[PDB]
Curated annotation (Swiss-Prot), chains A, B:
Superkingdom of the organism of origin: Bacteria
Pfam families (UniProt xref): tRNA_m1G_MT (PF01746)
First-level EC class: transferase
Protein's GO biological process: tRNA N1-guanine methylation
Role description: Specifically methylates guanosine-37 in various tRNAs.
Major location (coarse): cytoplasm
GO cellular component term of the entry, any: cytosol
The protein's Enzyme Commission number: 2.1.1.228
The keyword Disulfide bond appears for this protein: no
Residues noted as binding S-adenosyl-L-methionine in the record, renumbered to the chain: 90, 117, 137-142
Name of the protein described by the UniProt record: tRNA (guanine-N(1)-)-methyltransferase
Family membership: Belongs to the RNA methyltransferase TrmD family.
Species for this entry: Haemophilus influenzae (strain ATCC 51907 / DSM 11121 / KW20 / Rd)
Taxon lineage: Bacteria, Pseudomonadati, Pseudomonadota, Gammaproteobacteria, Pasteurellales
Length: 239, 239
């Protein structure tokens, strides 16, 4: 469709990506051609009898690396399919830390190619010669780049028009039926039908929750007059 | 086995979890009974004809929330299956930010229950009454908690003995065959077979890469004498 997104994926385990292409909001996006996810498996680019996709690191060490030739050939094939303009991304803990601002940046691309490493990762020279950007989804280590790739895909998919049916703050609390749950009642303001009061309450809650849980996030913001007031109110009430 | 881990999962899309239970290192862990992942679907705890799992938020707004009764009943069932000692975790951007230290903390639990929200999330009172800890995998918004749950599972699985076949720094570069790749050569030290020189080179590279890419990570460390020296060397060479 309009701001259709195409994402090429290089992975030894392409079936993992069914988790986003077959279910939920992202599954719908794929079915409706708002999002296309296309996978290439380095194992298909091997030539030896046992289809070897790993190789030993120079200098020794416990682990293995992705074998260069099958991975390189898979990447080249994905690039040829993408045509001009596709940004190639490698997922790793050494990459730029993903946050919502970074998601909105990545979402500007009509085409992405995501390279998923396994084992101890990929040859440094491939990063230099084939990768445009290195990204991390957070400061922790996983068994492979597939979950980070899927996480990135899901996050950017939300910005594709038609996929869905924030302002630097944590979300406010939400309530649904029943009116009373284990003695806990819904805040009366949410029952009032006073849409302006409800708005300000939610905003105040978001400011309070951000202040108590993630105060560093507030330092990155230029609060509006209204937000400054409601935050001061919340801090006074907290005291 | 020994430090076997059991993880209960509450999700509207349990088939997504095949991505970790059927493939790779985590698939092996599950097959070998080092890791058990057990899923309950709130849709199975509905009683109406159309198996409704969402509900309208008090106070209005665009989105929907998880319906309380099916979700609550699924959680209670998972808790009964887990028996005593299981920590219940809700995945959301309002939670404690996951990092490797937090992974090692979570890995100390023999039993976890992971609640995956969809839509605009779950009722605040359920968080108060059913959830022990809220965790986030990073400062970005996804369509549901399943990818964060899987990310958490993968990260903690790596600490289960037998699953695998770091010190605050980014990883060093890695090289494998061929010796020359698009004119780019493997660092001679890695070919030298001098294991002490190789160690120090890798450590120096990790310190240099951490300094250039993530200097804030260094401020959280008490560097060893050796690390202080190699970092000073790298910074001098960089200049
Ligand atoms: N933090 C990450 O984005 C990441 C990427 C790959 C991997 N094996 N582990 C972690
Ligand atoms: N950052 C997170 O851990 C997260 C959890 C749930 C969701 N829908 N989006 C993001």
């Amino acid at each position: 469709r309009g701001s259709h997104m195409w994402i090429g994926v290089i992975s030894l385990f392409p079936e993992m990506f069914k988790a986003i292409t077959e279910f939920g909001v992202t599954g719908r996006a794929v079915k409706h051609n708002l999002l296309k996810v296309e996978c290439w498996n380095p194992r298909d680019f091997t030539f030896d009898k046992h289809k070897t996709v790993d190789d030993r690191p120079y200098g020794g060490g416990p682990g293995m690396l992705m074998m260069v030739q099958p991975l390189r050939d898979a990447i080249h094939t994905a690039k040829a399919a993408a045509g001009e303009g596709a940004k190639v991304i490698y997922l790793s803990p050494q990459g730029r830390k993903l946050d919502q601002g970074g998601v909105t940046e990545l979402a500007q691309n009509q085409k992405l190619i995501l390279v998923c490493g396994r084992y101890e990762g990929i040859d440094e020279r491939l990063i230099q010669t084939e990768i445009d950007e290195e990204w991390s989804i957070g400061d922790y280590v996983l068994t492979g780049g597939e979950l980070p790739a899927m996480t990135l895909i899901d996050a950017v998919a939300r910005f594709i028009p038609g996929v869905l049916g924030a302002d630097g703050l944590l979300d406010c609390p939400h309530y649904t039926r029943p009116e009373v749950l284990e003695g806990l009642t819904v805040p009366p303001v949410l029952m009032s039908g006073h849409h302006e009061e409800i708005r300000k309450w939610r905003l105040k809650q978001s400011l309070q929750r951000t202040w108590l849980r993630r105060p560093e996030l507030l330092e990155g913001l230029a609060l509006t007059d209204e937000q400054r007031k409601l935050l001061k109110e919340a801090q006074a009430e907290h005291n």
